[PDB]
Amino acid sequence: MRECISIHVGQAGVQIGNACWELYCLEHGIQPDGQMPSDKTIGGGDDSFNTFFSETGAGKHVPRAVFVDLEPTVIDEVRTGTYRQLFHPEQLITGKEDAANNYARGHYTIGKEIIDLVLDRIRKLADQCTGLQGFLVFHSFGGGTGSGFTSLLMERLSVDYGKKSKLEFSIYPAPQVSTAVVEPYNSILTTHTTLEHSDCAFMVDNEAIYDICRRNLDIERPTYTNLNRLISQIVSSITASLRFDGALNVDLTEFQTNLVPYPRIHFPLATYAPVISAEKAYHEQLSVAEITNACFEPANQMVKCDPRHGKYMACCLLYRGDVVPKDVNAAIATIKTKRSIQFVDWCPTGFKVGINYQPPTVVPGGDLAKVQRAVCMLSNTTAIAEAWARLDHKFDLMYAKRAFVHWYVGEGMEEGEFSEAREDMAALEKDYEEVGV
């Protein structure tokens, strides 16, 4: 057994972290007070779920997680929330004033006065580990904290934990729920600085999640709660192999091995199905073939793009519920003859499959209905580069006039870092182009 530490940075990271750990507790049968009756090894053990939960002699199972925000508002709701007993004070870190949607303010100014504290609180968890794999980092692209402080943290972790892997769960900015006009600046800046330090990053476009909630859950105006409970399901599907018994993606290194052949191109596309409304009176349960086919519909992807006009490098299917290999293979064979699925010439055209017989758990009172079988496809396709193209275009429009730049320069950042970050992104789009066409 090897441990994994989850890091939640900024508002988006924290609130998503709350959704995930809430769901984790329900899947492992852990109560809000940290008690896990099914765990017959009191005070310790090296089970699969111990990857995410450490144990106290009193029989409390606590998340191997740290929450950090440069403002106390969001985390204070974790300190007083329903799962207040779950975490302990040293895990919940808060500053006084936030980064004000400013990357430079989060990275340089305010980041400098709290980074040492954070790493110390992280080190305290790492000391409780017998064999640390690495870290799972949750944050937004748009936030000043989520962008600025994250990149700084990722740099130091590569120094203090050079041999450890580091995965990302990143929220890509969408105007329908954007909080700032400069989020494209922050996105490009944190991506450039974090790129060499991230082994594998799962991007979630709020645009995609917003429309999935509107279209499939019939929620006219999805709240962050609506978005986050859906995201937590996807994140759960991805990390389930680290928390349950299996032979696929059993450690963090295997994620890079199975999904990321080229280091820089480490942004796998996630596609999830089925998403069904809880207040949907009558629903016909979907089959293995139907949910597997839905993995190739852009309307179900975490990022809206067209994989038909790109090339795959890897593709993993992660089923939960009543599913057996026979039906999976039958579904794949059918789909292959109906849909455009081009792999790069230097990769085998195939699928790695993982099945967990326990169907997806739903939060009581949530928006998602219980389903008999669900799937999450992790495909490394060059089509996700469309998101970089969109983002870099918005960056170019503003930076051409140096709009809002003075806010970053005023925090000690150089104007050169803008162009240096943008050049790194220009190279990234090129890398995707070489592989994809």
Binding site: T73, A100, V182, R221, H406
Partner: protein
């Protein structure tokens, strides 16, 4: 994140007193300073503007300043006069005689330290002071002269805090003296350097609204201040109440100000209403959106079609379909996308608050950073030059130690500001 409020001069104290009167009612706070509401939404972010004393007494974090006691004695004898901390009354006796020099260099310089002692006393109580907001006029002497002196000295002691201002612009339609263009021009020079956000409240606009739209034959300063207090309540809604975006002045500044000098906003409001006259029909969302963008609803007498919007912030109040708000706001942008700059993607943001202002089931407040604001500064510049080319009325200022060069410099900077706005109107 606490905000320290300051109100300077006759105009500053009269709109300032009116402002506290309005929001105190919204937060359920009575003239005694005691809460009597029915919603917790009222008290969640009340720390931003109010200090809490023992027995749960709420006292405005407000500092009242003037070079004569006349207007402040009226405030203290006004409806909510008792709510203010009596030590925060800092006043002189000589007055400023509508003279910027007197407020900035002589009469005001003698009093300014006494004010900063009260500012410092308030700030030291703040858990995390985020910034200041000033209410004043630019046409007089105290609010214009001493007000900008205060801003400069506050920018010397708290250089990493946000400075915001509600600045009343002079107009011949509503004029007290002929030297208002001098006082205003000298003040704009200061505001351009030492404020992050300035709400341009044009007395010309406020008059035209009262006359043309509200059909008030002879509008008073009271009528004008009904529009100001309503506007001030709106623009501070997100700072005072729970919502999506979490109440702070820096995030407003970052998102609204693409270039540091271009931070002069056009406020707008809908529906436009007069005092006493109650409206019985609530406006539909399409009506709120249409009106709040109409020039007739702008508090700065500038035509938004003569310029382009750099950024826009809109706050809808009342119980409504936030979906319908989204559609209507997106409709405006998609219908008139030419009046929005294309090099700032998604430069229009909207927020909604359940609590409506008193007397209305719903409302909409507009905060626009338009290049059309140059029309305001050009207007002042023309009036300035008409007198200055003959050095008229200048002896009032040179008598206080000022030189003609300082006028020439102030004139030059405002004309620069104008040309800067013009630069981005043709980008």
């Amino acid at each position: 994140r606490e905000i320290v409020h300051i109100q300077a001069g006759q105009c500053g104290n009269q709109i300032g007193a009116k402002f506290w009167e309005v929001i105190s009612d919204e937060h359920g706070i009575d003239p005694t300073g005691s809460y009597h509401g029915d919603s917790d939404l009222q008290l969640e972010r009340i720390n931003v503007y109010y200090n809490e004393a023992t027995g749960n007494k709420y006292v405005p974090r407000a500092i009242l300043v003037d070079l004569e006691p006349g207007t402040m004695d009226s405030v203290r004898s006004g409806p909510f006069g008792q709510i203010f901390r009596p030590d925060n009354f800092v006043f002189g006796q000589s007055g400023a005689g509508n003279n910027w020099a007197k407020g900035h260099y002589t009469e005001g310089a003698e009093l300014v330290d006494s004010v900063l002692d009260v500012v410092r006393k308030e700030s030291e109580s703040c858990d995390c002071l985020q910034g200041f907001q000033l209410t004043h006029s630019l046409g007089g002497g105290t609010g214009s002269g001493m007000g900008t002196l205060l801003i400069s000295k506050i920018r010397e002691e708290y250089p990493d805090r946000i400075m915001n201002t509600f600045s009343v612009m002079p107009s011949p339609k509503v004029s007290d003296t002929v030297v208002e263009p001098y006082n205003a021009t000298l003040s704009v020079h200061q505001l351009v350097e030492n404020t992050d956000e300035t709400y341009c409240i044009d007395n010309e606009a406020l008059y035209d609204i009262c006359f043309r739209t509200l059909k008030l034959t002879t509008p008073t300063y009271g009528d004008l201040n009904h529009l100001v207090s309503a506007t001030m309540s709106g623009v501070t809604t997100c700072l005072r109440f729970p919502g999506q975006l979490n109440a702070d002045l820096r995030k407003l500044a970052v998102n609204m100000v693409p270039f540091p000098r271009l931070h002069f906003f056009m406020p707008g409001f809908a529906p436009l209403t007069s005092r006493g006259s109650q409206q019985y029909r609530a406006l539909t969302v399409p009506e709120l959106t249409q009106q709040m963008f109409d020039s007739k609803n702008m508090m700065a007498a500038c035509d938004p079609r003569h310029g382009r919007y750099l950024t826009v912030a809109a706050i809808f109040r009342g119980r409504m379909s936030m979906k319908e708000v989204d559609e209507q706001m997106l409709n405006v942008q998609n219908k008139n996308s030419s009046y929005f700059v294309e090099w700032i993607p998604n430069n229009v943001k909207t927020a909604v608050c359940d609590i409506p202002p008193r007397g209305l089931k719903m409302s909409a407040t507009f905060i626009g950073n338009s290049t059309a604001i140059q029309e305001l500064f050009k207007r002042i510049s023309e009036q300035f030059t008409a007198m200055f080319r003959r050095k008229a009325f200048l002896h009032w200022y040179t008598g206080e130690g000022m030189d003609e060069m300082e006028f020439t410099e102030a004139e030059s900077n405002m004309n620069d500001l104008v040309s800067e706005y013009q630069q981005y109107q043709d980008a």
